[PDB]
Design a protein around this ligand. Structure first.
Ligand SMILES: [Mg+2]
Ligand SMILES: [Mg+2]
Ligand SMILES: [Mg+2]
Ligand SMILES: [Mg+2]
Ligand SMILES: [Mg+2]
Ligand SMILES: [Mg+2]
Ligand SMILES: [Mg+2]
Ligand SMILES: [Mg+2]
Ligand SMILES: [Mg+2]
Ligand SMILES: [Mg+2]
Ligand SMILES: [Mg+2]
Ligand SMILES: [Mg+2]
Ligand SMILES: [Mg+2]
Ligand SMILES: [Mg+2]
Ligand SMILES: [Mg+2]
Ligand SMILES: [Mg+2]
Ligand SMILES: [Mg+2]
Ligand SMILES: [Mg+2]
Ligand SMILES: [Mg+2]
Ligand SMILES: [Mg+2]
Ligand SMILES: [Mg+2]
Ligand SMILES: [Mg+2]
Ligand SMILES: [Mg+2]
Ligand SMILES: [Mg+2]
Ligand SMILES: [Mg+2]
Ligand SMILES: [Mg+2]
Ligand SMILES: [Mg+2]
Ligand SMILES: [Mg+2]
Ligand SMILES: [Mg+2]
Ligand SMILES: [Mg+2]
Lengths: 124, 147, 210, 52, 52, 51, 124
RNA sequence: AGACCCACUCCCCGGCGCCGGGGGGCCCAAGUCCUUCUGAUCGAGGCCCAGCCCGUGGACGGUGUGAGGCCGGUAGCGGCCCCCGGCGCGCCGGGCCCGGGUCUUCCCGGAGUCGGGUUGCUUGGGAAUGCAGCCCAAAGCGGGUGGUAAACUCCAUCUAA
RNA sequence: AGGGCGUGAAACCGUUAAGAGGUAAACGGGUGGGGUCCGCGCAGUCCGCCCGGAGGAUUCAACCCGGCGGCCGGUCCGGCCGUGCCGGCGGGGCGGAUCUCCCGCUCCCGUCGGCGGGGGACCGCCCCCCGGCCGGCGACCGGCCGCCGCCGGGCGCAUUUC
RNA sequence: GGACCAAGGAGUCUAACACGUGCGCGAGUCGGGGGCUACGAAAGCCGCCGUGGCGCAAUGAAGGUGAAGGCCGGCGGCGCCGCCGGCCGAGGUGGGAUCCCGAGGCCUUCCAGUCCGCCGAGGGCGCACCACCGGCCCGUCUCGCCCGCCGCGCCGGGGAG
RNA sequence: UGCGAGUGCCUAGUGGGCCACUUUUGGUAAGCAGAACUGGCGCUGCGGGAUGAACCGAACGCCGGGUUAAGGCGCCCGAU
RNA sequence: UCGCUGGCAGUCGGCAGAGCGAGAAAGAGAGUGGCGCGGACGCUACGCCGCGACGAGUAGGAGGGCCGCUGCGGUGAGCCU
């Protein structure tokens, strides 16, 4: 995400700012030069960025470098990426609601017969 | 810690937070999850569709060791070997292709999800999917099957 | 009674589970007792290996595990006689034996035979009578140098055949893995019924021609 | 910080000897009383005998 | 009270080590030792190391 | 001790895999940061008159 | 650093007294003896303390030097002043002001010195 | 078992004697120093330029409050004295005159049991997992098992009573 | 502490003292009266600066000698460190799913091909020695110089200082 | 319900699940079982002790299958597929905190012009998130035409909606 | 005309009600039984109705001053 | 109590120059030419300070307790014949 949003046009050699954690992503091959500021960076992410030739900053250094935070691109992680969010909203077993139910285990015998089929009674 | 919980704040309040009209009785709805068909019907329908009834076949003596087959994706394919291998393969102009044996890593089937870097490979797996095979062909490389 | 959205659970607490609850407060005591007994055994068998007899290479049975090797029960009679040790002498010199295990292939047989012969070359045999050396004994130079070894006598380590980079052959490029797999499935599924239809057609042919 | 000073080894008589070693980075590791407290609190219950 | 109360607690090894590093780091600041209450007004150097 | 716990660049020699924990902020001296020309430059005038 | 050590010891010091809705610090070099970041006598890079002399005449002024911060034995330099009240006050005021030595508390230093001299004066 | 080759006299126990853990018993450091409170001190102060003395002994208990040095203990791969066993040694006596490889010729197994029908109990075991009652009642390239009853046909793996 | 005897509470009772008493008693708010005690109440605060008057000191400013300390040297000299970098006709440890001389084994009439290991090269990281930049010495300084301050001792001698 | 007073006296512990908070590590994570080294039955270490759990892939009752494409150039049977080779290569619309640019302008005599800071019409790249449109994977249905070969088959694969 | 809005989780208690102006069904009627709208009581003290769950006024932190609501001003009892 | 998610690190002092409340954006801007040694308090920032509006409550919910009881680890050169 950070590389994509920093290679979006216009925002060249600006400082990416994360008030969270920068984790490593193994399904990406080439790492550009980066100027990151973050609360904490995982060890492999640090190794990748520094080997690619980037610079990692803490927020005190960011404050010293730019008190008004100008020249910065403020990012965040996907807030609804947690597995908890697929259980929310319109209740399962209600027409047009793709909500994940709470099942003890997934399989053939667990919550698949009567509110799910059309042969076994009805389908929601 | 009992210091921090709710029973300490309820000292002096008569009903202990359970109301006075409807007291805290013992089992005012039946033990466990009884009445799923009768008086908890709409709870069961509204949050547990498909709970009642049967569907499908039976398998009397099922063996997960027989049914065991982990999968890996073309995104993670290059992670299974050291990056020294990838760097040297890209650097080398002879045309030699590194061998990626996924059974050694512990995977049996290769599924092709994402991009694959422009580099020849010999992928040595047990099963393949059609799209994974076409992507490996497109990058230029071989899929060799093992038993 | 069920409440708003939640999971429906099945606690197996309807028997009298409290009259039989196995606590583990004596776990450190059991560990200390086990290791004290282990040390006592190790020093009652003075120069012999602490872990006991040598054990052979074994493949794990099922498809989930048939790529790994481990230690077995004992060396089989066939590999033991190929190596040339006697049935009643192997376990008195420190070789585990089990007469129940077969030998289906030859590579595993030969690997176990190599392991057994290397162990035999490695071991040191003290004299039965300290002042009376015999033919098969070891000499005093290594008798003064014999000692215990810790852990498994010869650790069984599974290694992978290093395979180097190769040029890609156009035949390997033209190989069609998914199609071959699906056709193998189909052939294995339709083998018998195709044979029955072939026999039936051959029969119809014989009364058409006879 | 990052700079590591040079601490002298003291003889048994009390005065400094001729030897000295650089400060290990452990003494420059971060200090967090909150989870020091957490770890102490949780580990301190592990030597406790049961009663009933 | 039953004997099968949860008497023992588990903590992660990584933060066990983190806390031990924090304690070592805090042991080498004179104000923290004084705050803890040790009388070290006449110690030559705080990370006090002696001969072997 | 530094063999036990490693340095900032060298991993621990007798741990399985351990390194020192990173710092969330390097320069903890807050007064020095606040009364610095870079930050004093980009500030408005204080309003300390009580109304 | 000073702020970090203050965060550590703001509420968990053996010099801290909490009773009667009042808070105090009994550390050696704390003027006004109150628990405060400014007046704390331990966490600061440079500090000054004012004590009664060993004998019942004069005042001892304790200065914290700059070099040996981790060497407690040679970190504080003492100076005994036994004069009249006005010259003692002038000497303390000069010591702070014209050395520019932590000047936020020269007034408190002379308050404490005057109190100590008043106590040393004979009582009726 | 026979024949031919190679190898072998290092086994055991019953007694007798000799050499290097357990049980019991008795012991092993240092202030009742000076001054001063108290009904009684184990309290308080002091004992230097060796910050009284011991400390591998500052656990505990007793003693007219509150004791490392008053007493018992505590520490020590500390000591001494008895008794029992083992691992070791030598002697006497007794028990056995014993192996392996190759070829040839022979030998080779557990029944009112297995299995089948039905009935009752049991099990997750579902056209019947296990057990039992009654009836039927075996075979020898046989028999058992291979989680759906049955027939036909190849494989695998064991050898019940 | 007087043989069911450490401490000795409440309900209840006796007596002494004070007070009160025809709407059972008790209670809230507002005063008033009377008591028991306290203030150790009973001629009522001090604190700075200045003016005036009587006093008494080893006495002030300045100067000199010594010690310590705080800040600097536009760029004084020397060190040490870097969660920095650059070099190396440098000396090593760790790792590598990066490559390739010897030994062991197996199958072949001292031989070809094969398997296990050891060795060597290469790569990455780290440690150390050499040289060069950069940054710091405000989690981490030493010496010379300059300024300032303080203390001790002389000298100061009374329109000063106290 | 209640003569009066004292003492005692009632949401606890285990397991499971769900959500919210705090900490460590982070596409991984976790030794809890085992092993090695007075308080200490603690603590430390193991990584070829990660076996294993949860997560990283879903869908189908099951056999099973399993998560972007377009363009260029010509041919074979206008287009389309394949041979090919190369090129680009991982969505779009609206709203979006923040960031970027900048018509001009912020006085101490007057003009010109420098630097720094600042404000700013208008214009941009757009986080997380919401709404909508497309796309891909599994099951199923409808309509169709091609491709593959070790076994050309009651074979295998592919397309559109 | 007035006002800062949108949005997500987890959630206790409740699921016996009663009264009043106007509308209104059964009944001779009811301090009866049953509905509609709004406001109350329940969960709420305060001034007036002598007295009162729901009536009239008005809703409540601890206080000083002033003024009113509904209701009052022979005496009880503040005010002709 | 709530809101302003208001203000305060500027205690910027002889190495000095005292300001940021006032209808109407933004410089107490830098440069180029034409004697007497002195100055209160403050800021446990989990602190201090300034304005506004508000304050009924059973069932129930939440927050704060320098309220209280017993025991453990630290600490007070704590107290006591
Ligand atoms: Mg309540
Ligand atoms: Mg509740
Ligand atoms: Mg009740
Ligand atoms: Mg209820
Ligand atoms: Mg009810
Ligand atoms: Mg309940
Ligand atoms: Mg409920
Ligand atoms: Mg005693
Ligand atoms: Mg004494
Ligand atoms: Mg004593
Ligand atoms: Mg004692
Ligand atoms: Mg003694
Ligand atoms: Mg003794
Ligand atoms: Mg002893
Ligand atoms: Mg049953
Ligand atoms: Mg079957
Ligand atoms: Mg008594
Ligand atoms: Mg008594
Ligand atoms: Mg009385
Ligand atoms: Mg009377
Ligand atoms: Mg009664
Ligand atoms: Mg959650
Ligand atoms: Mg009614
Ligand atoms: Mg009610
Ligand atoms: Mg209400
Ligand atoms: Mg009301
Ligand atoms: Mg009336
Ligand atoms: Mg009023
Ligand atoms: Mg009236
Ligand atoms: Mg309220």
């Amino acid at each position: 995400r950070m590389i994509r949003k920093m290679k979006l046009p216009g925002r060249e050699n600006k400082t990416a700012v994360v008030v969270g954690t920068v984790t490593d992503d193994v399904r990406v091959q080439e790492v550009p030069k980066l100027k990151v500021c973050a609360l904490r960076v995982t060890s492999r992410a640090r190794s990748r960025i520094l080997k690619a030739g980037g610079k990692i900053l803490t927020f005190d250094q960011l404050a010293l470098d730019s008190p008004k935070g100008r020249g910065t691109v403020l990012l965040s992680g996907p807030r609804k990426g947690r597995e908890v969010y697929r259980h929310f909203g319109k209740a399962p077993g209600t027409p047009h609601s793709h909500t994940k139910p709470y099942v003890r285990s997934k399989g053939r015998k667990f919550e698949r017969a009567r509110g799910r089929r059309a042969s076994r009674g009805y389908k929601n | 810690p009992s210091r921090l919980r709710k029973t300490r704040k309820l000292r002096g309040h008569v009903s202990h937070g359970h109301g006075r009209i409807g007291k805290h009785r013992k089992h005012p709805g039946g033990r466990g999850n009884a009445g799923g068909m009768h008086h908890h019907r709409i709870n069961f329908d509204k949050y547990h569709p498909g709970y009642f009834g049967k569907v499908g076949m039976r398998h009397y003596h099922l063996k997960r060791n027989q049914s065991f087959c982990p999968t890996v994706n073309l995104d993670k394919l290059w992670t299974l070997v050291s990056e020294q291998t990838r760097v040297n393969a890209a650097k080398n102009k002879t045309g030699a292709a590194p061998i990626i044996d996924v059974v050694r890593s512990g995977y049996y089937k290769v599924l092709g999800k994402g991009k694959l870097p422009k580099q020849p490979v010999i992928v040595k797996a047990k099963f393949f999917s059609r799209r994974a095979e076409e992507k490996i062909k497109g990058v230029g490389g071989a899929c060799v099957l093992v038993a | 009674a069920p409440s708003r959205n939640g999971m429906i659970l099945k606690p197996h607490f309807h028997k009298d589970w409290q009259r039989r609850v196995a606590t583990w407060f004596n776990q450190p005591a059991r560990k200390i007792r086990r290791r004290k007994a282990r040390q006592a055994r190790a020093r009652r068998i003075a120069p012999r290996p602490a872990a006991g007899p040598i054990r052979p290479i074994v493949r794990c049975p099922t498809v989930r595990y048939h790529t790994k090797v481990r230690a077995g029960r004992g060396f089989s009679l066939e590999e033991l006689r190929v190596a040339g040790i006697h049935k009643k002498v192997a376990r008195t010199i420190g070789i585990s034996v089990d007469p129940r295990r077969r030998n289906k292939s030859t590579e595993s047989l030969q690997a176990n035979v190599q392991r057994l012969k290397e162990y035999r070359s490695k071991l040191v045999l003290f004299p039965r009578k300290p002042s009376a050396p015999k033919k098969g004994d070891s000499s005093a130079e290594e008798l003064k140098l014999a000692t215990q070894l810790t852990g498994p006598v010869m650790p069984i380590r599974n290694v992978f055949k290093k395979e180097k980079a190769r040029v890609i052959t156009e035949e390997e490029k033209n190989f069609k893995a998914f199609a071959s797999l699906r056709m193998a499935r189909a052939n294995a599924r339709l083998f018998g019924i195709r044979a029955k239809r072939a026999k039936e057609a051959a029969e119809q042919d014989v009364e058409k021609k006879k | 910080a990052c700079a590591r000073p040079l601490i002298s080894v003291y003889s048994e008589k009390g005065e400094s000897s001729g030897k000295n070693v650089t400060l290990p980075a452990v003494f420059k590791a971060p200090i967090r009383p909150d989870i020091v407290n957490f770890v102490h609190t949780n580990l301190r219950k592990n030597n406790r005998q049961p009663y009933a | 009270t039953k004997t099968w109360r949860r008497w023992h607690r588990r903590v992660n090894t990584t933060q066990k080590r983190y806390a031990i590093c924090s304690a070592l780091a805090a042991s080498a600041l004179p104000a923290l030792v004084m705050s803890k209450g040790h009388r070290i007004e006449e110690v030559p150097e705080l990370p006090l190391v002696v001969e072997d | 001790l530094d063999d036990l716990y490693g340095t900032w660049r060298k991993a621990a020699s007798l741990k399985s895999n351990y390194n020192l924990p990173m710092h969330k902020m390097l320069n903890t001296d807050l007064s020095r940061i606040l009364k610095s020309p870079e930050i004093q430059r980009a500030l408005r005038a204080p309003r300390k008159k009580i109304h | 650093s000073a702020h970090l050590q203050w965060m550590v010891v703001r509420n968990c010091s053996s010099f801290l007294i909490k009773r009667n809705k009042q808070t105090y610090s009994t550390e050696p070099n704390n003027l006004k003896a109150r628990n405060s970041f400014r007046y704390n006598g331990l966490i600061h890079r440079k500090t000054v303390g004012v004590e009664p002399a060993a004998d019942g005449k004069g005042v001892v002024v304790v200065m914290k030097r700059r070099s040996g911060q981790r060497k407690p034995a040679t970190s504080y330099v003492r100076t005994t002043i036994n004069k009249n009240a006005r010259a003692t006050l002038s000497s303390i005021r000069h010591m702070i002001r014209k050395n520019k030595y932590h000047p936020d508390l020269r007034m408190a230093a002379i308050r404490r010195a005057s109190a100590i001299l008043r106590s040393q004066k004979p009582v009726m």
